Each structure stands twice: as C-alpha cells, then as structure tokens.
C-alpha cells in the first residue's frame, strides 16, 4: 500500500526528477519509465 | 576397550563435549547423523479443537504445539501407530493430554506448556511429562489470551522419528571437528596475504601439537581424533542420546545382516 498510495501515472528520467521521484522505483513493461513514485 | 577411545572434556545436562579417537571418519559421521535423525521419541500429532476464541489461528496453534519438548525417557516402551493394532490411538502407542484455558482478568494470560495436563496413563513409564527448562518453571509459552478468551483442545502425541518430521528432533545441535591444524590438508585456507593470521585458531588447536614447517606431508595420516559437542533440546539427557543413537545404528546394521540371512 505505502508505495501504491504515492504512485503516479503518466498518460501516454530527466535530471529535474532528481529529488522528486525515486530514480529506481519504476515498474516493468511499457509502464516502465512512465509510472513514477514520489 | 581397544575400540574407539572416548574422553569427555565437558558434560552438562544440556550438552556434552568429548573427544573420540581410534576410529575412522565414516563411523564418526554416521554417529553424528544417526543421532541427528534416527531416534524414537514422542511428539504431538493429533490436535482436536473444542473451541478457539483466540486471535491466533487453529493450525497456527497446532503447529506451535508440535514443537513442545516432551518427557522421552522410555520411548522404547512406547510403540508406533503403524504397528499398534488399536484404532486411532491408545496408550500402548500414544499419549493423551489436554489444554483448557480461559481469560479471566483483562491482563494478558500467558498459556504455557505447564498448563498441559496428561490424560492417558503412562503405566508408570517415564514419558509424556512436558519438559521445562524455565527457571520459573512456567514452560514453553504456548499462546496468550485476552480478558475473556476461551481455548480448549485435546492433543495426542505419538512415537515418531525426526527423520519423519523435525518435530521428533531430540538433537538440538552437534558441534563436530577434527584436524584443527589441518595436518591432513583437506582444506586450502583462502586468504588475502596469509591464512595463518587471517584465520583464527580453533579452541581444539591447544590439544594437538602444532605442525612443523619443515615436516614433509605425511600422506599416510588419517583423521583419527575427533571433537564432538552434542547438545540436546532437553527431551532426553545427552548421555541417553548418545547411547540410544549408537543402539539405533547397531539395530540398522543388524537388520541389514538379518535381511542378508533371510535372502
């Protein structure tokens, strides 16, 4: 739950993301690099 | 006797440490394993639930109960359900006890193994009594109850072997070692610079002569001396564990011989 609550969707990684969304926590598949977590 | 020579360095109701020489590796390894696996003993098998008003799940509880150590002096006097011709169970091959507890005060009620009440008759056989190493004698903490939780159930324990299921494990642990000086070169110590400093010396080292750098490798050497510290959970005294394991291995070999004669 903890992550999924903080989960973020990208309707279909840049430096700015640094300090905003975990560069690691990303799903697989097409969503990989699209769905982010805070 | 001229057979394997035994020298107990330390003995305790929990564990016994000794040295075994005048024997080959195989016999020592076999002794270790037979002690580990082949020992008849008593363990809870059947759990019948009268009522569970506890947070914990029934099967959770029964699982834990299965781990309770038991008085197992005379298990030999006890038999196997497989052999016994009684239905379900009977004293000749099983022991019956019960647990009935009920929350009384709001404070947590700690249900321990001491609460266990033997029902079946031991025939005076030194078996079944729960084993308690508690200083307070409370026994194993079976579970915990709320202000008014009720838990009543019946248990039937039977004679089985750890090999069949670890719940019949009388052997808590087995320290085992030999050639502390590695005079047999059975291992190449890994190291960055020097194994001698990087590796610590086993305590047994002090009881054997340190090797000499100029000595040629005595390829004829064999692992004769052995160090063994056997620790039991508490079901049976260590000495009984050793004796009984030896006896079981003897029985196995004797059965092999009997089969040979039968063919």
């Amino acid at each position: 739950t903890l992550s999924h609550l903080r989960r973020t969707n990208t309707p279909i990684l840049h430096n700015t993301h640094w300090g905003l969304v975990c560069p690691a926590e990303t799903p697989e598949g097409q969503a990989c690099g699209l769905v982010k977590n805070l | 006797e001229e057979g394997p020579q035994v020298k107990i360095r330390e003995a305790s109701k929990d564990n016994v440490d000794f040295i075994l020489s005048n024997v080959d590796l195989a016999m020592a390894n076999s002794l270790r394993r037979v002690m580990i696996a082949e020992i008849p003993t008593l363990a809870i098998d059947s759990v019948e639930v009268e009522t569970n008003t506890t947070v914990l799940a029934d099967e959770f509880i029964a699982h834990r109960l299965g781990l309770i150590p038991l008085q197992s002096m005379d298990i030999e006097q006890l038999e196997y359900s497989r052999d016994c011709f009684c239905e379900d169970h009977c004293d000749k091959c099983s022991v019956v006890l019960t647990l009935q507890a009920f929350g009384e005060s709001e404070s947590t009620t700690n249900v321990y193994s001491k609460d266990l009440v033997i029902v079946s008759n031991l025939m005076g056989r030194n078996i079944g009594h729960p084993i308690i190493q508690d200083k307070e004698g409370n026994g194993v903490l079976i579970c915990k109850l709320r202000k008014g939780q009720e838990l009543k159930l019946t248990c039937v324990a039977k004679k089985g072997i750890a090999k069949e299921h670890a719940k019949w494990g009388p052997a808590a642990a087995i320290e085992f070692e030999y050639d502390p000086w590695n005079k047999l070169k059975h291992t190449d110590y890994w190291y960055e610079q020097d194994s001698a400093k990087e590796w610590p010396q086993s305590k047994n080292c002090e009881y054997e002569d340190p090797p000499n750098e100029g000595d040629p490798f005595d390829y004829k050497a064999q692992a004769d001396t052995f160090y063994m510290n056997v620790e039991s959970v508490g079901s049976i005294p260590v000495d009984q564990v050793v004796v009984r394991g030896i006896d079981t291995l003897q029985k196995k070999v004797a059965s092999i011989l009997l089969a040979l004669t039968q063919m």
């Binding site: 430096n15 990989c32 690099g33 | 190449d188 890994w190 960055e192 004829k220």
Partner: protein, 765 residues
C-alpha cells in the same frame, strides 16, 4: 488469428520448471499429478493386453493405471465411476487411455517460442513433486531460466506422432543447431566451472572417491584405470577421471600459441582415444563453440552417444564438487592498497588530462578534428580518456588477482564471466553514458543543483570514481541510475519490437522449401535457388576449415605441393614408399604429378579470385583433417616405415573420389555442369589436403588406409547432402529471429525498404 493461426488445445499441461543434475538430456521430470491427469489412448494388442489388462485393473486412482476403456463400438467406459475396472476383458482394437508412463516420448515448449530449439521432445521420468525437471544443459537452447519460468506440455495421441516426434525433435538429434554451424548447447554453470578445478594439473584424488566416480558414471567400462601416482601413494588425475567418461576413438587436437608439446600452462587441448593429455578443459572445448569436444563426438559417434556423454560428463563433475565444494565472497572482490593506489593515480592521471584538454579547449587552441566539430572532438577525447583509465584499472586489478580468487577462477573458466564486472566490482565503475553521450545539461548549463554552471569535469558529467564495494556517492548513484532506465527501456521494447519483426519474416519465407530436384521454389513453384544455398549441402554438417592453397608465399606452396622425380629441386624421398628408384626418374608419373600441380596452381589463383579478402578459413563440408587422424589411429599407422602406396594410386584415387562426389542426378550436361559447380570449392581443398606430397611426407598412410579414407570421405559427403523437403526458409527466418533479440532498427530499415534512408554515406577508394 485467434482461431486458425492459433487455438487452445487439449492433452496439454504447463507449469514451472525445476532442475535435475541426475537427469538425462531426453528425460524429463513429470509431476505425478499431471500423469494422473494425462493418459494415452493405446490400442489393445496381444503384446500389450497383459499389462493393459493390469493397468485397467489398476484404474484411474493408481499412478500406473488407466481412466477409460474404449470398445470397438466406441463405448468409452468410465472406470472412474464404475467397478467394471475389475470386470471388463480387453479386446484387440480396443482403445484404453493409459496413464502416461516413463519413456513415453513427449514434447515441451518454453515461451515465447522464439525458434526451433524451443521445440524438443523427451522421455517421461515420473517424480513425486509439482514441477518439471530439466537436465541442466538443455536450458540454453531453451533460453530457459529457473527464476520461475513455465513451460508448455504436449502429449501425442497417435503413435505415428510418437515416432514422428521421436525422429524429428528428439533432443540429441538437434544437438547441433544449423543456424550457426555450432553446437546448440553445452556444459554450463557450476559444471563448467567445476571441471576447471577438476581438470587442473594440480589436482589429485584418493582411491575412496575414484572407486566412487567410476560407479557414479553409468556407462563406465567396468575397468579400473591405473593411478598416475604409484610409489609414494596411489592416486589418479582429474584428467584421468574425465577421460574415463569420454568414449574411445576421440581425437580432438586443438593447438594454441602456448602449445609447445610441453604447455606449462596446459593451454589448448589434446586427447587421443579419449585419453586427455594437454589443455585445461575450458568453455571453448565443452561449450557451444563448434571447435569444442562435443561437436567432434557428434560426428565421430552420432547423437545417441553424446546424450550419454553429457550425463557421463555431467554426473561426474557435480559429484567431485560435492566433496570439494565451491563458493565466493567479498574477498574475491577486494584488492590490496597498491593495486587501488595505482588505480587512484590512473584515474587522476586521466582527470588532469581531461583538465588539460579542457583548458586547451577553453583556450580555443584545440583544433577541430577533420570533418568533426571541436566541441564533440573535445568530448570524444575526453570520453576516450576516461575509457582507458577504467580499462587499465581493471587490467591492473586483473593482474593482482590471486588464483584463489573464486570469481577470477569463475571468469577464467568462462562461466558467466566478464572482465568489466570485476573492474567495476573492484575498480571505479566508470563513466555513465546515455545515447552514448555524457550527462546532458538537464538543468540550465548544468545537470544537478550541486554543480556550478558550465562545468565539464568528469564527475560533473557522469563519471564514476568509486567502486561498487566503495559505494556510490549520491551524485554517482543518480548518474548510474540514469543509464539503467535506458537499458531497461530497450529491454522491454525489444520484447515486443523483435516479435513484430520476427512475425513478418516467418510469413515472408513461409512457402520456401527444398525440392527433391535439389532446387528451391515457392508455393507457386517459382524458383528461388537452382541449388539450395548454391551448394546443395545442409548447414548442419558444415564447419570452418583451412584453405591452405591460399596462404603462404609463392615459393611456399610449390615446396609443400610440388614434387619432382627427375631433378633435385623437389626430389621425392624414395623411403616414403616401398617403391624407391622404381619411381624416381619416372616421367610418366612425373606427368601425373604435373596436372595436379597445375590444377592446384589454377585453384590457388582461382581461390584468390574467390576470396579477395585473403582469408583461408571458411565453412565447408566434411573435416578432411579429422578423418586423416582417425585413419592414423584407425591402425596406429607407423609413420617411420615406407608405405605400399603409389603415385598412380594416389593420383587415380583423388580423380575417382571427385567423380564420386555426385549430388545431382540429371545426366544432361546442364545438370552435370551444376554438379561440377556445386563441389568446386570442396574438391579444390580435397586436392589440396590430398596432395601426393602432403599424402607422402606428412601423412604416411597405407594403400589400404588411403583408400579407406576415400571410402570414408564419400560416405560422409553423401550423408552431408542437404535433405529434400526442408522447410529451410522457416529455419532461415528463425536463424534471423534469434540474433535479433540481442543496429536492429537498421535491420528494420532493411526489411522495410523505406527509401528515405537515415544515415546516407559513401565509401570511396
């Protein structure tokens, strides 16, 4: 698409896979539950009704049983809901759905079904747990992984399928995958690693285990090998041990630059009659490489032996590890201060150079490299620089690795080895790159808030100084992560993009097949090739061989070929043959020597035209070299005595063999011309390696033996002819689908004509 080109089916199962060292190649662990759910409708016969009757008596509730009995009238009797299992009497022609038993040929499938290797049948080996067992080795061609992969099951219902499968997809039968003329599989993982320790010179084994491994080997000859060590103590060699496993008659002979008949490093590999002498067993020998042991055994014996070979090799290696053991640890990664210090200066050595060039560029003194922008060239040298230091650091780290280092041991064996790993593992991880470029200024004139604007220091643009063991600084960690997503994206994108590419290709070549006339057409009968692959030879029997007539100086080939029976320049030694002066001075034979020489001379220039690259190694049918050694060993030929051969016998035989190289059958000259064309290259080499001079001085064979070679050659040559009816296009397509999974959009650019090219360029000599 969903109903005809693909559908659900029955008599099938799918579950997760599990390993078994104790299992054979064509055997598979079958979960008992599945067997209790899958049966076979066998037809009652006099030779099986007995066990069938008993199986019926067993019923559906027993593991070796049956579920239904089918009368000739179609009465599919249910034994599940009937006591008739003890009452029905079987009649011939009745069908009974017999519970699948062991030895039953059955088919697997690992998804996605990338290509052919995905489809092998095996033999049933029931097991009491709920998952499949697979012999380790098969996984690679399966592209399997035991992370939890599932695999499909297909159970044939008609015996014709049984045989059909048993002769077309049986594991050993495809041991060599014709996509790359190399073994489809090989020894892998621990076994590959363990052998290295086992086969290493330094190893020795006590009799206790030697007794054990012998009976551990299933097909052991039952013969006690002699210990290599006698007086101080009885002992054997791992090499000895592995040799026992190998079947006799094997004569793999690999040389390396370190091969000197002494090989203190025991490089290369040399075995005689299965007795190992030189070379530590390495991936190049027991791996999937074509030049390794397995490939040779495949042709010298045949597939049905190699299956035993694997298990024999396999079972041993695991055992010897069982009583040795093998592990790793951080110590395998740590190095000494000196090593790290040297690395430290190495990095700083580069950094200043980067700084030096940086100032140079800041000076506007660095010039633009030809046809390239100073900005990029400035970077190009920079990124270049960082590469060497990272490279040398691992180099330096590699030098100081101890033999005890398990990973080093792991890499030296080649089991999943990678130099860059240890370097990154031990030394600086190295520069991170994305689109092959440094970290771009995602921020205004910078990348991260921790850097002033307009800075290009190595670290400032994504360099990594610390090692994995040292722990990445946040700056490093972030940069390193950035490159990760890049690889991750292409990981998923390929899993779909390749399939689309793959799907098109299969259809593109679907109706492409080989015709009995040794030709290729489409479903419309439109010719594709007049001779399949232009040689009519199956790739499955082709491997790279030397073309000796190409290389060497002009003076050289004459010396190693030309022989003169009249003059001193190329005087044949009479002792080479039982006939001496009877031959010398013989112009008639000297003539016979002539046409060969000119014929070879024609070939040399001809091949020069064929291979303008000068390369003298190419895939060809039938390893002539290998056969020669077999002949030598075939009768342990005394290479120190004159032979009964005569030049005429030598000359006629090669001519005769050439005639015998008949692939085509049309007696019309037109077909005959093609036949000559097909074997053109192969016959040239045949002449080369069969040159009388080579045949006499180097290959001192008997007349009986020499002929046996000719008969031997033709036998294989015929066996190597491509079979007809081959669905080659499908195979070829799969030959392309596989490497696609591992530039690629460039391929897609090829498949789709797409006149609008991306990167137009010219090559002008």
């Amino acid at each position: 698409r969903g109903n005809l080109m693909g559908k659900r089916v029955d008599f099938s199962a799918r579950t997760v896979i599990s390993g078994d060292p104790n299992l054979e190649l064509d055997q598979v662990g079958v979960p008992k539950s599945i067997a209790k759910t899958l049966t076979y409708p066998e037809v009652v016969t006099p030779y099986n009704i007995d066990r069938l009757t008993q199986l019926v008596r067993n019923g559906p509730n027993e593991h070796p049983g049956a579920k239904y009995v089918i009368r000739d009238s179609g009465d599919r009797i249910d034994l599940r809901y009937s006591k008739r299992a003890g009452d029905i009497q079987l009649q011939y022609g009745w069908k009974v759905e017999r519970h699948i038993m062991d030895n039953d040929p059955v088919l697997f499938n690992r998804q996605p079904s990338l290509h052919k290797m995905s489809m092998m049948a095996h033999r049933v080996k029931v097991i009491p747990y709920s998952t499949f067992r697979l012999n380790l080795s098969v996984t690679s061609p399966y592209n399997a992984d035991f992370d939890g992969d599932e695999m499909n099951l297909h159970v044939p219902q008609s015996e014709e399928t049984r045989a059909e499968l048993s002769q077309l997809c049986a594991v050993p039968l495809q041991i060599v995958s014709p996509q790359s003329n190399k073994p489809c599989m090989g020894i892998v993982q621990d076994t590959l690693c363990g052998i290295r320790k086992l086969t290493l010179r330094d190893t020795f084994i006590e009799l206790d285990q030697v007794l054990n491994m012998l009976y551990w080997v299933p097909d052991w000859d039952g013969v006690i090998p002699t210990p290599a060590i006698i007086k101080p103590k009885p002992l054997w060699s791992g090499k000895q041990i592995l040799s026992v496993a190998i079947p006799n008659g094997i004569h793999l002979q690999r040389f390396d630059e370190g091969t000197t008949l002494l090989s203190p490093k025991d490089n290369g590999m040399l075995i005689i009659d299965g007795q190992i002498i030189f070379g530590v067993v390495e991936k190049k020998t027991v791996g999937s490489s074509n030049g390794g042991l397995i490939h040779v055994v495949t042709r010298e014996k045949g597939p049905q032996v190699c299956a035993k070979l694997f298990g024999n090799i396999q079972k041993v290696v695991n055992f010897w590890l069982l009583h040795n053991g093998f592990s790793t640890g951080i110590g395998d990664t740590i190095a000494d201060g000196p090593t790290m210090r040297e690395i430290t200066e190495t990095i700083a050595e580069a950094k200043k150079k980067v700084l030096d060039v940086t100032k140079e560029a800041q000076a506007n003194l660095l010039t633009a490299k030809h046809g390239m922008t100073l900005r990029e060239s400035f970077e190009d040298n920079v990124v270049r620089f960082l590469n060497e230091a990272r490279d040398k650091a691992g180099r330096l780290a590699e030098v100081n690795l101890k033999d005890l280092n398990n990973v080093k041991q792991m890499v030296m064996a080649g089991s999943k080895g990678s130099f860059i790993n240890i370097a990154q593992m031990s030394a600086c991880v190295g520069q991170q790159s994305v689109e092959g470029k440094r970290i771009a200024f995602g921020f205004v004139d910078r990348t991260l808030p921790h850097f002033s604007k307009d800075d290009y220091s190595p670290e400032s643009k994504g360099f990594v100084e610390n090692s994995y063991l040292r722990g990445l600084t946040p700056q490093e960690f972030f940069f390193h992560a950035m490159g990760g997503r890049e690889g991750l994206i292409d990981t998923a994108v390929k899993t779909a993009e390749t399939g689309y590419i793959q799907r098109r290709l299969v259809k593109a070549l679907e109706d492409i097949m080989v015709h009995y006339d040794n030709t290729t057409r489409n479903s419309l009968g439109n010719v594709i090739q007049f001779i399949y692959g232009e040689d009519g030879m199956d790739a499955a029997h082709i491997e790279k061989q030397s073309l000796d007539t190409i290389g060497g100086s002009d003076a050289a080939f004459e010396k190693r070929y030309r022989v003169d029976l009249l003059n001193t320049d190329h005087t044949l030694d009479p002792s080479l043959l039982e006939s001496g002066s009877e031959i010398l001075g013989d112009l008639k034979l000297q003539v016979l020597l002539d046409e060969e020489y000119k014929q070879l001379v024609k070939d040399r220039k001809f091949l020069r035209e064929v291979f303008v690259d000068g390369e003298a190694n190419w895939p060809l049918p039938v390893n002539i070299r290998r056969i020669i050694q077999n002949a030598q060993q075939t009768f342990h030929i005394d290479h120190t005595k004159p032979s009964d051969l005569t030049i005429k016998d030598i000359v006629l035989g090669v001519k005769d063999l050439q005639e015998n190289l008949l692939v085509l059958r049309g007696k019309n000259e037109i077909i005959q011309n093609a036949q000559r064309d097909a074997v053109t290259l192969f016959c040239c080499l045949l002449r080369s390696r069969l040159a009388t001079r080579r045949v006499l001085q180097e290959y001192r064979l008997t007349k009986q033996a020499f002929d046996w070679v000719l008969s031997n050659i033709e036998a294989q040559f015929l066996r190597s002819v491509v079979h007809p009816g081959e669905m080659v296009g499908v195979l070829a397509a799969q030959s392309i689908g596989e490497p696609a999974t591992q530039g690629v959009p460039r391929l897609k650019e090829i498949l789709n004509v797409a006149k609008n090219m991306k990167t137009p360029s010219l090559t002008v000599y």
